[PDB]
From a paper:
Within this work, the possibilities to perform SSX at BioMAX, the first macromolecular crystallography beamline at  MAX IV Laboratory in Lund, Sweden, are described, together with case studies from the SSX user program: an implementation of a high-viscosity extrusion injector to perform room temperature serial crystallography at BioMAX using two solid supports – silicon nitride membranes (Silson, UK) and XtalTool (Jena Bioscience, Germany). Here we have presented an initial integration of two SSX environments at BioMAX in order to collect diffraction data from micrometre-sized crystals of membrane and globular proteins at room temperature. The environments were different fixed-target scanning supports and an HVE-injector for LCP extrusion experiments.
SSX diffraction datasets from galectin-3C crystals were collected using XtalTool supports and silicon nitride membranes with U-turn continuous scanning and an average data collection speed of 100 µm s−1. The crystal size did not exceed 20 µm and the X-ray exposure time per image was 0.05 s for both datasets. The second dataset from galectin-3C crystals was collected using silicon nitride membranes. A volume of 0.4 µl of the sample was distributed directly onto the membrane and covered with a second membrane to create a so-called sandwich. Two sandwiches were needed to obtain a complete dataset with a total volume of 0.8 µl. The resulting experimental electron density maps were of excellent quality, revealing the presence of lactose (ligand). (<0.2 Å) between galectin-3C structures determined at 100 K. The core of the structure appears most similar, while shifts of up to 0.77 Å are seen in surface loops. On the whole, the data collected from XtalTool were of slightly higher quality, allowing, for example, the identification of more well ordered water molecules (117 versus 72) at the same resolution.
Residue numbers in the entry: 113 to 250
Amino acid sequence: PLIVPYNLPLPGGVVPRMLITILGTVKPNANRIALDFQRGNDVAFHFNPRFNENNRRVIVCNTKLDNNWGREERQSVFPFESGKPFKIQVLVEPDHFKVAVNDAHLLQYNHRVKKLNEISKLGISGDIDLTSASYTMI
Ligand SMILES: OC[C@H]1O[C@@H](O[C@H]2[C@H](O)[C@@H](O)[C@H](O)O[C@@H]2CO)[C@H](O)[C@@H](O)[C@H]1O
């Protein structure tokens, strides 16, 4: 449905209790998915399932400040499956983004970018069909 890369405005930025739900389907032979929670040019939270990083599936999380990626946080747990529908839920908590994929907690990403209200765009890219990207307050 939705065009990828998709930019989901997060009006007024993120706030704890904001739940962002991304439904899509990983393309066959997907290489990557990326969610980029952006604070302007900075990526407050880059959530980057990599389907083939040295023949491993890994989730790389990072923050890009001033065009410099920070310390990657890597999660070996990889709930995405090429070709398959997924649901990513990013719950903004006070101290971290909490990411659940297909209703299973996947990872937390401590806020490195502290101005949550300035994290006002979510870029959704990569090898997905994007069915829906929405947010709500829980
Ligand atoms: O850190 C997220 C960021 O990673 C970049 O790739 C890194 C790669 O993860 C690392 O193993 C290597 O040593 O450096 C690369 C360049 O910084 C991706 O290019 C970028 O898109 C993000 O996913």
